[PDB]
Amino acid sequence: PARPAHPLDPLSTAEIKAATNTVKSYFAGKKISFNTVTLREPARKAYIQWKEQGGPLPPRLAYYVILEAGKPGVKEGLVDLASLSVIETRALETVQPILTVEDLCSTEEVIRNDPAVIEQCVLSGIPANEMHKVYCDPWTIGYDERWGTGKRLQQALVYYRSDEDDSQYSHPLDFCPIVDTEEKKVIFIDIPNRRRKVSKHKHANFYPKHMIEKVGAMRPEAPPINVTQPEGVSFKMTGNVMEWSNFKFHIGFNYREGIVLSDVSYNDHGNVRPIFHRISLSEMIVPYGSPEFPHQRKHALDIGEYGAGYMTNPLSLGCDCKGVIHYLDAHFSDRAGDPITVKNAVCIHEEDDGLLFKHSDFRDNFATSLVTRATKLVVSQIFTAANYEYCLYWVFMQDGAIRLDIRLTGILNTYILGDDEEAGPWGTRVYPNVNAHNHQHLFSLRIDPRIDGDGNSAAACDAKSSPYPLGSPENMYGNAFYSEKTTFKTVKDSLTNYESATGRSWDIFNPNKVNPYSGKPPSYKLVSTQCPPLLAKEGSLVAKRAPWASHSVNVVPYKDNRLYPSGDHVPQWSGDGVRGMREWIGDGSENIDNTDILFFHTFGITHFPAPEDFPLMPAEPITLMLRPRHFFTENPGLDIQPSYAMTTSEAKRAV
Amino acid sequence: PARPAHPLDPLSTAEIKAATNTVKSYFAGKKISFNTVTLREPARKAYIQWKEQGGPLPPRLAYYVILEAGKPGVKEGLVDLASLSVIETRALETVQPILTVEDLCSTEEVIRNDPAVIEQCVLSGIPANEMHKVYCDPWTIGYDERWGTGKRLQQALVYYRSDEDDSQYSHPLDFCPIVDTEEKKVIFIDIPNRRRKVSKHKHANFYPKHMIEKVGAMRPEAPPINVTQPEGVSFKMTGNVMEWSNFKFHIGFNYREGIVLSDVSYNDHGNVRPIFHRISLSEMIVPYGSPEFPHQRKHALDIGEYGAGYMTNPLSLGCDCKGVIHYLDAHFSDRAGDPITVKNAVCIHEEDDGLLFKHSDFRDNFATSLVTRATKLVVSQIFTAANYEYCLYWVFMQDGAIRLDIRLTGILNTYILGDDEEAGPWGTRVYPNVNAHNHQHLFSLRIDPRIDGDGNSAAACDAKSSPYPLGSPENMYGNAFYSEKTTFKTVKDSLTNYESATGRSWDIFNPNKVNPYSGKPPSYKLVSTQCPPLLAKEGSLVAKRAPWASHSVNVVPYKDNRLYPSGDHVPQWSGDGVRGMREWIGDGSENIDNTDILFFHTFGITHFPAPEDFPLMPAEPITLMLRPRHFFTENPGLDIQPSYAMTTSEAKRAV
Ligand SMILES: [Cu+2]
Ligand SMILES: [Cu+2]
């Protein structure tokens, strides 16, 4: 195909096709199907040389994952787009790949047409002639020791709608069909010892017509609040490259991680200084807390099992982004090797963010005063994973800080509850016969830093009282306290958790440089507090398949292609084996001090459902920030025009 | 005077005057001065009876604090405005009151004219004829065991401006004058053993003219982002009473706490349910961490030693509040007993707050979808405490949650640093010869709840893995986990801290009611995470004067007039004695389960200064929230008109 403007640009629909064509040719005569066709980003070293040392343009490569009918597992490899050839390929017969919307969408019809499933519905109080009202969310089996990776399986969380417009979640069924993805047939049905027939209650619906019926009527439309940017926006985009408030970076996107920000830097009044080479969400795990069979299989690693890209919502229509928006489209490949597009997958825009800073002198009753307002750049995406939606917002700020805001909304995963059955301690009865199980939403932020250049380190920062006691010459009044910096020398040293006791934060810094004022190295500080401990016991399915989740921080040596902490092919992996984070950690002895490192941060929330979350849940916020500390020698936004400003002398002139 | 519309309305300029006149007459022939004239809110019981049981209008009372020339301490009491008579009065000879801007504003001139002070300036390298270039921030002495409360004292943090438009903070002097407030004269000067003369560097300024000089020029004005509400706002204010999104409450204000929200309720579709009887910030402490003399004296309790009302900035001018704003004014009394007004002390308005909730069905490629945007109500104030500004935002949201957002900005407190002196572990060298000491900003949120009525309790909620181990019949895969609820029975039980290990949150609930769905009592959950431990040792000045700061939560029995946790008259109290929180706690044995309680939450941040905070610091955020959990039986904003909505059937018609 034709090369892209930038080496990190996602593959075009043409490159995708050229790739699939190349692969189909390689496997001529073989009945292959496409699971993934995505960009294989260039080597970190190659890229940087090209970008800053006049190095050559890296080869435009494509990474693929295919399935061959009658063959176990998958086959993966690389295609060198320029020469249209498969330059690397291999078969992984004992692994299962990410579930595309294509392998997922057929499942509902298959269980609907399965005699066994039909009998269970009838048993459950649903006539065999009404199977059209039976729905199901297709999930990976997650992991079921009965089959391992010997069969590509899915589990169907079954629900019932008395009307197509209903929200099915108030009416879950009690059984769980296991489906062979490839064979397209139910191979087993998990049935509870205690049977619970369909709820006979009205569905808990949320559309206006439903509401008008539920409560008298809808609230009157409210006076509008219109946002307008008459002279345009202040950011400038050159292809996928963004430019705003001295920040400059490339906005990428892929089937798995979704948004990928790269080559982030800041123009420090002429001096363009690197901050991060790449940053994104590399994995997740949403572990449920009911120990009852088969609920252990509910611990989805959405990024690696479905893909934040594959599940993304086209943003335009819903009014998700308010204001002067700038969109980006996403391109994948379908099962056939043909490009597929999802319009407005990413939405870019700037908004007001209140005050940036302010100060007035009390001496002239605040006449002397200066106010500068703040505006933030937001790069967003919103994806749907069956019942829930994850709204992601990468936020850049005018003080040099970068923040990740997430908002969880959508619908609670629900299971059936008997008339006289207690939601017990593992879940909440949010509606008659509905049980919403406890669960955690955990994310793994992957940061590849380049804080003010190459050669970085990480450290834990704990606030501490002076060791000297009250009344001592050294701490006479006992108010002394400082910040204890523990820089990680070895991988093992970094495996740390957030501690409230010390208001812990983590620094990613450049030990090769010093701030001329403070004397400290330049750095970006991770200020994250929503760091839940992994509640699943050690050695549990959850803990094993998500090795990265047991620690708030995991810092390992950089290596090309160390992206996914739970492994490259996550579905149905048992958790046994040295891959992903477990492999990168090794024996924990590798050096991570003043070298090229990778920082994986686990953050998230623990959800204990309340009726307020049903039938549709109000957004729940999660945030984390990376602030520059000792990076600059003074506040960097002081040359931004203030909103208001009166000098002391001027206040005098005004009389 | 004339009665106000609402019993909770602050005193009018008329009531203030009628009050001072009444006091002056009572102390006829005595040379008295006014320190405080404010509303003495009605008893909780009387107020409620009047509000909901047709009880009588409570008497309009005014609380005063006066000083009498030649008398030690102060005198306080109540005036029954209706009958214009002092109905209660008493003298506190061993106490010192809050510092008004009047007792604070004379200090700079007195040290300027003091011979001792002048000599120190000369010594420090500033000619005696340039004392007009010497400035000082007048602070409470805090507490100095050399004088106790025997004299009303202030300590002057001395600075130097080479030009009146300079920001003095880059040029602190090394000594600290002690001034007798009443006598208006320097009684002592703390001089360090190691002398450090005035810095000879340029001042670190931040006005545009300064910046143009510093860096080549200012950034070009940015394209505007205009916010317009053509058809008005959606909230309705009847006097101080606000009504918005089913919320209804009274917006009060006073010299000390600043904004005070009262009688908060929510209209649950016709059922008006109480939530909070009163909520506000009752005290603060900003303890510094340098153990060196006299820096122990830096631990300001701003609310009780200066007043969030007294220090508040008139909001209009600065462009603090963007959009269609509705202001409120504040009225206090000056030294003479004459009313004083600070216009636009509070600013009210509603803004966009992104998505409220959203959900799309993957079955018809998200055609089936519903999106409802969120708007929040903001009642704000911004006060200046010498060098820093505290921006306060009480936020009400459409899911029934209430949030308190704080943003810290302004300027770092700085002390002089020797050319070859290390800011050591206690502070940071943010600029040549400038040392910014470590410190914490802590706040005491006082909540008087009425969760869905009377008879409340509080509890600590901790996330826990099941006690049964991996492989046991009860937790076969080890994923089981729940929330441990520990409801406080006795005051002692409540003294708790936020714990990251359990992702702890606290519940204020009504044990007399039950959610018909979940079976739990109605409640509002405190989701707060920026809860720094008090770093000052026990028995320290800080820990003693701020009894409430040692715990994230303190729950005590309600009693009329239990407002200020550090006592009613905070300046110069040693911290020895049963008053404030220490008094309310008692032997910690009083019941707090299902009764009228008071919840004081300690939250804030620990500030380790970095050059980025100098010479003017970018806002630092702090937040805390109170969400309804089990209060409602379903999402309460479902009847808000969605921004977009397509039914499954409708998506079919659209073909
Ligand atoms: Cu959840
Ligand atoms: Cu601070």
Coordinates of C-alpha atoms in Angstrom, one line a residue, chain A residues 118-517:
Chain A
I118 CA -35.1 -24.6 24.8
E119 CA -36.1 -27.3 27.4
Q120 CA -34.4 -25.2 30.1
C121 CA -36.4 -22.2 29.1
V122 CA -39.6 -24.2 29.2
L123 CA -38.6 -25.5 32.5
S124 CA -37.9 -21.9 33.5
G125 CA -41.5 -20.8 32.6
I126 CA -40.8 -19.7 29.0
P127 CA -42.8 -21.5 26.3
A128 CA -40.7 -23.1 23.5
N129 CA -42.5 -20.9 21.1
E130 CA -41.3 -17.7 22.7
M131 CA -37.6 -18.3 22.3
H132 CA -37.5 -15.0 20.4
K133 CA -37.9 -13.3 23.7
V134 CA -34.9 -15.0 25.1
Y135 CA -31.6 -13.1 24.9
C136 CA -28.1 -13.6 26.1
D137 CA -24.9 -11.7 26.5
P138 CA -22.1 -13.8 24.9
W139 CA -19.0 -13.9 27.2
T140 CA -15.7 -15.8 27.1
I141 CA -16.0 -18.8 29.3
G142 CA -13.1 -16.9 31.0
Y143 CA -11.6 -20.2 32.2
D144 CA -13.2 -23.5 32.9
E145 CA -10.9 -26.3 33.9
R146 CA -13.2 -28.8 32.3
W147 CA -12.0 -27.8 28.8
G148 CA -8.9 -25.6 29.1
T149 CA -8.0 -24.2 25.7
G150 CA -9.0 -27.4 23.9
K151 CA -12.1 -25.7 22.5
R152 CA -12.8 -22.1 21.9
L153 CA -15.7 -21.5 24.2
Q154 CA -18.2 -18.9 25.3
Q155 CA -20.7 -18.8 28.1
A156 CA -24.1 -17.2 27.6
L157 CA -25.5 -15.1 30.4
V158 CA -29.2 -15.7 29.6
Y159 CA -32.0 -13.0 30.0
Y160 CA -35.6 -12.5 29.0
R161 CA -37.5 -9.6 27.4
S162 CA -41.3 -9.5 27.4
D163 CA -40.9 -6.8 24.8
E164 CA -38.0 -6.0 22.5
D165 CA -37.7 -2.5 24.0
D166 CA -37.3 -3.8 27.5
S167 CA -34.0 -3.8 29.4
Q168 CA -33.5 -7.5 29.9
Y169 CA -31.4 -7.2 33.0
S170 CA -34.3 -7.4 35.4
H171 CA -35.1 -10.8 34.1
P172 CA -32.0 -13.1 34.2
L173 CA -32.5 -16.9 33.9
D174 CA -30.9 -19.4 36.2
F175 CA -28.8 -21.5 33.8
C176 CA -25.7 -20.9 31.8
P177 CA -25.1 -22.5 28.4
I178 CA -21.5 -23.2 27.2
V179 CA -21.0 -22.8 23.5
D180 CA -18.4 -24.0 21.1
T181 CA -17.5 -20.9 19.1
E182 CA -16.1 -22.7 16.0
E183 CA -18.6 -25.6 16.0
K184 CA -21.4 -23.1 16.7
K185 CA -23.3 -25.3 19.1
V186 CA -24.1 -25.7 22.8
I187 CA -21.8 -28.4 24.3
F188 CA -23.0 -28.0 27.9
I189 CA -25.4 -26.2 30.2
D190 CA -24.5 -25.3 33.8
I191 CA -27.7 -25.7 35.8
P192 CA -28.1 -24.8 39.5
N193 CA -29.2 -27.3 42.0
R194 CA -31.8 -24.8 43.1
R195 CA -34.0 -23.8 40.2
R196 CA -35.4 -20.3 39.9
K197 CA -38.0 -19.7 37.2
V198 CA -38.3 -16.4 35.3
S199 CA -39.3 -13.4 37.3
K200 CA -43.0 -12.5 36.9
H201 CA -42.4 -8.9 37.7
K202 CA -42.6 -6.0 35.3
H203 CA -39.2 -5.3 33.6
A204 CA -37.4 -2.3 35.1
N205 CA -37.2 0.0 32.1
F206 CA -35.6 3.4 31.6
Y207 CA -36.7 5.0 28.3
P208 CA -39.0 8.1 28.6
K209 CA -42.1 6.2 27.6
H210 CA -41.3 3.7 30.3
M211 CA -40.6 6.5 32.8
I212 CA -43.8 8.4 32.0
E213 CA -45.6 5.2 32.9
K214 CA -43.5 4.5 36.0
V215 CA -43.5 8.0 37.5
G216 CA -46.2 10.3 36.2
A217 CA -44.1 12.0 33.5
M218 CA -40.7 13.2 32.4
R219 CA -39.1 16.3 33.9
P220 CA -39.5 19.3 31.6
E221 CA -36.7 20.0 29.2
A222 CA -34.3 22.3 31.0
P223 CA -33.0 25.7 29.9
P224 CA -30.0 25.1 27.6
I225 CA -26.5 25.8 28.4
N226 CA -24.8 26.5 25.1
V227 CA -21.0 26.2 24.6
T228 CA -19.6 28.1 21.6
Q229 CA -16.1 28.7 20.2
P230 CA -16.7 31.5 17.6
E231 CA -13.1 31.9 16.6
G232 CA -12.3 28.2 16.6
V233 CA -10.3 26.0 18.9
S234 CA -6.9 26.5 20.2
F235 CA -5.5 23.1 19.4
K236 CA -4.0 22.1 16.0
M237 CA -4.0 18.6 14.6
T238 CA -1.7 17.5 11.8
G239 CA -2.9 14.1 10.9
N240 CA -3.0 12.2 14.2
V241 CA -0.4 14.5 15.7
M242 CA -1.9 16.9 18.2
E243 CA -0.5 20.3 19.3
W244 CA -1.9 22.1 22.3
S245 CA -0.6 24.3 25.1
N246 CA 3.0 23.3 24.3
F247 CA 2.1 19.7 24.4
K248 CA 2.7 17.6 21.3
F249 CA 1.8 14.0 20.8
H250 CA 0.5 11.4 18.4
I251 CA -3.0 10.0 18.9
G252 CA -3.1 6.4 17.9
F253 CA -5.8 3.7 18.2
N254 CA -6.1 -0.1 18.0
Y255 CA -8.6 -2.9 18.4
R256 CA -7.3 -3.8 21.9
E257 CA -6.1 -0.8 23.9
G258 CA -8.3 1.7 22.2
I259 CA -6.6 5.1 22.4
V260 CA -2.8 5.1 22.4
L261 CA -0.9 8.4 23.1
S262 CA 2.7 8.4 22.0
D263 CA 5.7 10.6 21.6
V264 CA 4.4 13.1 24.2
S265 CA 6.5 16.1 24.8
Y266 CA 6.4 19.7 26.1
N267 CA 7.8 22.8 24.4
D268 CA 9.5 24.5 27.4
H269 CA 9.9 27.9 25.8
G270 CA 11.9 26.6 22.9
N271 CA 13.2 23.5 24.6
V272 CA 11.1 20.6 23.5
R273 CA 11.3 18.0 26.3
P274 CA 10.1 14.5 26.1
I275 CA 7.8 13.1 28.8
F276 CA 6.4 9.8 27.7
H277 CA 7.1 7.6 24.7
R278 CA 3.8 5.7 25.0
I279 CA 0.8 5.6 27.4
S280 CA -2.4 3.6 27.4
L281 CA -4.6 1.1 29.1
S282 CA -3.0 -2.3 28.6
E283 CA -5.5 -4.6 30.3
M284 CA -8.4 -4.9 32.8
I285 CA -10.1 -7.5 35.0
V286 CA -13.5 -7.1 36.5
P287 CA -13.5 -9.9 39.2
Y288 CA -16.9 -10.7 40.7
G289 CA -17.3 -11.8 44.3
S290 CA -19.8 -14.6 44.5
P291 CA -18.1 -17.9 45.2
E292 CA -21.0 -19.8 43.8
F293 CA -20.7 -21.9 40.7
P294 CA -20.4 -20.8 37.9
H295 CA -19.9 -17.2 38.9
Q296 CA -16.1 -17.7 39.2
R297 CA -16.1 -17.5 35.4
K298 CA -17.1 -13.9 35.8
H299 CA -13.8 -12.0 35.7
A300 CA -13.6 -10.5 32.3
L301 CA -10.3 -9.0 31.1
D302 CA -12.2 -6.8 28.6
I303 CA -9.2 -5.3 26.9
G304 CA -7.5 -8.6 26.1
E305 CA -10.7 -10.7 25.7
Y306 CA -12.8 -8.3 23.6
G307 CA -10.8 -5.2 22.8
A308 CA -11.4 -1.6 23.8
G309 CA -11.2 -0.7 20.1
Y310 CA -13.5 -3.5 18.9
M311 CA -16.2 -2.5 21.4
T312 CA -15.9 1.3 20.9
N313 CA -19.1 3.4 20.3
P314 CA -19.2 5.7 17.3
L315 CA -19.3 9.0 19.3
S316 CA -21.3 11.5 17.1
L317 CA -25.0 10.5 17.4
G318 CA -25.4 10.2 21.1
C319 CA -24.3 13.8 22.0
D320 CA -21.5 12.3 24.0
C321 CA -19.1 15.1 23.3
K322 CA -20.4 18.7 23.7
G323 CA -18.9 21.6 21.7
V324 CA -16.5 22.0 18.8
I325 CA -15.5 18.4 18.4
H326 CA -12.8 16.9 16.2
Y327 CA -13.3 13.2 15.5
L328 CA -11.2 10.2 14.4
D329 CA -12.3 7.0 12.8
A330 CA -11.1 3.5 13.6
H331 CA -10.3 0.7 11.1
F332 CA -10.1 -3.0 11.8
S333 CA -10.4 -6.1 9.6
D334 CA -13.4 -8.4 9.5
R335 CA -13.4 -12.2 9.5
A336 CA -13.0 -12.0 5.7
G337 CA -9.9 -9.9 5.6
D338 CA -11.9 -6.8 4.6
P339 CA -11.4 -3.5 6.3
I340 CA -14.1 -2.3 8.7
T341 CA -14.6 1.2 10.0
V342 CA -16.2 2.7 13.1
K343 CA -16.8 6.4 12.6
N344 CA -16.0 8.9 15.3
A345 CA -14.4 6.3 17.6
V346 CA -12.3 9.1 19.2
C347 CA -13.5 12.5 20.0
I348 CA -11.2 15.5 20.6
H349 CA -12.0 18.8 22.1
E350 CA -11.1 21.5 24.7
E351 CA -13.1 22.7 27.7
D352 CA -13.2 25.1 30.5
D353 CA -11.6 23.7 33.7
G354 CA -12.2 26.6 36.1
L355 CA -9.3 28.5 37.6
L356 CA -5.6 27.8 36.8
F357 CA -4.4 30.1 39.5
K358 CA -5.3 33.3 41.4
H359 CA -3.9 35.6 44.0
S360 CA -4.9 39.0 45.4
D361 CA -3.2 41.3 47.9
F362 CA -5.2 41.9 51.1
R363 CA -3.4 45.2 51.5
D364 CA -5.5 47.1 49.0
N365 CA -8.6 44.9 49.7
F366 CA -7.8 42.6 46.8
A367 CA -7.6 45.5 44.3
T368 CA -4.2 44.0 43.5
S369 CA -5.2 40.7 41.8
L370 CA -4.5 38.3 39.0
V371 CA -6.8 35.5 37.7
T372 CA -6.0 33.0 35.0
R373 CA -8.6 30.5 33.9
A374 CA -7.9 26.9 32.9
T375 CA -8.7 25.0 29.8
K376 CA -8.2 21.3 29.3
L377 CA -7.7 19.1 26.1
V378 CA -9.8 15.9 26.1
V379 CA -9.2 12.9 23.9
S380 CA -12.0 10.5 24.5
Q381 CA -13.7 7.2 23.6
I382 CA -16.6 5.3 25.0
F383 CA -16.9 1.5 24.6
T384 CA -19.6 -1.0 25.4
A385 CA -19.0 -4.4 27.0
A386 CA -22.4 -6.0 26.9
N387 CA -24.1 -4.5 29.9
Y388 CA -21.7 -1.7 30.8
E389 CA -20.0 1.3 29.2
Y390 CA -16.6 2.7 30.0
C391 CA -16.1 6.3 29.2
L392 CA -12.5 7.1 28.9
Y393 CA -10.9 10.6 28.9
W394 CA -7.3 11.4 28.4
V395 CA -6.9 15.0 29.8
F396 CA -4.0 17.3 29.2
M397 CA -3.7 20.4 31.3
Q398 CA -2.0 23.8 31.2
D399 CA 0.2 23.2 34.2
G400 CA 1.8 20.3 32.4
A401 CA -0.2 17.7 34.2
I402 CA -1.8 14.7 32.4
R403 CA -4.8 13.0 33.8
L404 CA -6.9 9.9 33.1
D405 CA -10.6 10.2 34.0
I406 CA -12.9 7.3 33.6
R407 CA -16.6 7.1 34.2
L408 CA -18.4 3.8 34.6
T409 CA -22.0 3.7 33.5
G410 CA -24.3 1.3 31.7
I411 CA -26.0 -1.6 33.4
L412 CA -25.3 -3.9 36.3
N413 CA -24.6 -7.5 35.5
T414 CA -27.5 -9.3 37.2
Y415 CA -28.2 -12.9 38.1
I416 CA -31.5 -14.4 39.3
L417 CA -32.6 -14.3 42.9
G418 CA -35.2 -16.5 44.5
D419 CA -38.4 -15.1 46.0
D420 CA -37.1 -15.9 49.5
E421 CA -33.4 -16.1 48.5
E422 CA -31.0 -13.7 50.3
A423 CA -28.6 -11.7 48.0
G424 CA -26.4 -12.8 50.9
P425 CA -23.1 -10.9 51.4
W426 CA -21.9 -11.4 47.8
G427 CA -24.5 -9.3 46.1
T428 CA -27.4 -6.8 46.4
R429 CA -31.1 -7.2 45.6
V430 CA -31.5 -4.1 43.5
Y431 CA -35.0 -5.1 42.3
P432 CA -37.4 -8.0 43.0
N433 CA -35.7 -11.3 42.0
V434 CA -32.6 -9.5 40.8
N435 CA -29.2 -10.1 42.3
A436 CA -26.3 -7.7 41.5
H437 CA -23.1 -9.4 42.6
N438 CA -20.2 -7.5 44.2
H439 CA -17.3 -7.0 41.8
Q440 CA -14.2 -4.9 41.2
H441 CA -13.3 -2.9 38.0
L442 CA -9.4 -3.0 37.7
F443 CA -7.3 -1.3 35.1
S444 CA -3.6 -1.6 34.1
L445 CA -2.2 1.7 33.0
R446 CA 0.9 1.1 31.0
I447 CA 3.4 4.0 30.9
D448 CA 6.6 3.9 28.8
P449 CA 8.4 7.1 30.1
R450 CA 11.1 9.2 28.7
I451 CA 11.1 11.9 31.4
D452 CA 13.1 14.7 30.0
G453 CA 15.1 12.2 27.9
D454 CA 16.4 8.7 28.2
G455 CA 17.5 6.8 31.3
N456 CA 14.7 6.8 33.8
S457 CA 13.9 5.4 37.3
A458 CA 10.8 5.0 39.5
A459 CA 10.4 5.6 43.3
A460 CA 7.8 5.4 46.0
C461 CA 7.3 8.6 48.0
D462 CA 6.0 8.2 51.6
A463 CA 5.2 11.1 53.9
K464 CA 6.8 10.5 57.4
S465 CA 7.1 12.1 60.8
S466 CA 10.7 12.8 61.8
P467 CA 12.1 9.8 63.7
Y468 CA 13.0 12.1 66.5
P469 CA 10.5 12.4 69.3
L470 CA 8.6 15.3 70.8
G471 CA 10.8 17.3 73.1
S472 CA 14.1 16.3 71.4
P473 CA 16.5 19.0 70.4
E474 CA 15.8 17.8 66.8
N475 CA 12.0 17.9 67.0
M476 CA 11.2 20.0 70.0
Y477 CA 7.5 20.5 69.2
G478 CA 7.0 17.3 67.2
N479 CA 5.8 18.9 64.0
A480 CA 8.7 17.8 61.8
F481 CA 8.0 15.6 58.8
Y482 CA 9.4 14.9 55.4
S483 CA 9.0 12.7 52.3
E484 CA 10.8 9.4 52.1
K485 CA 12.0 8.5 48.7
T486 CA 12.7 4.8 48.0
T487 CA 13.9 4.5 44.5
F488 CA 13.4 1.0 43.0
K489 CA 16.7 -0.6 42.1
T490 CA 15.4 -4.0 41.1
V491 CA 12.1 -5.1 39.6
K492 CA 11.3 -6.7 42.9
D493 CA 11.6 -3.3 44.7
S494 CA 8.8 -1.8 42.6
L495 CA 6.0 -4.3 43.4
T496 CA 4.3 -1.8 45.7
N497 CA 0.8 -0.8 46.8
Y498 CA -0.8 2.6 47.5
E499 CA -0.7 3.2 51.3
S500 CA -3.0 5.7 52.9
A501 CA -0.8 5.7 56.0
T502 CA 1.8 7.6 54.1
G503 CA -0.2 9.4 51.4
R504 CA 2.0 7.4 49.0
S505 CA 2.7 8.6 45.5
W506 CA 5.2 7.4 42.9
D507 CA 7.8 9.3 40.9
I508 CA 9.1 8.5 37.4
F509 CA 12.2 10.6 37.0
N510 CA 15.5 11.2 35.1
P511 CA 18.4 10.5 37.5
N512 CA 20.7 11.9 34.9
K513 CA 19.4 15.5 35.4
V514 CA 18.9 18.1 38.2
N515 CA 16.4 20.9 38.7
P516 CA 18.6 24.0 39.0
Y517 CA 16.5 25.4 41.9

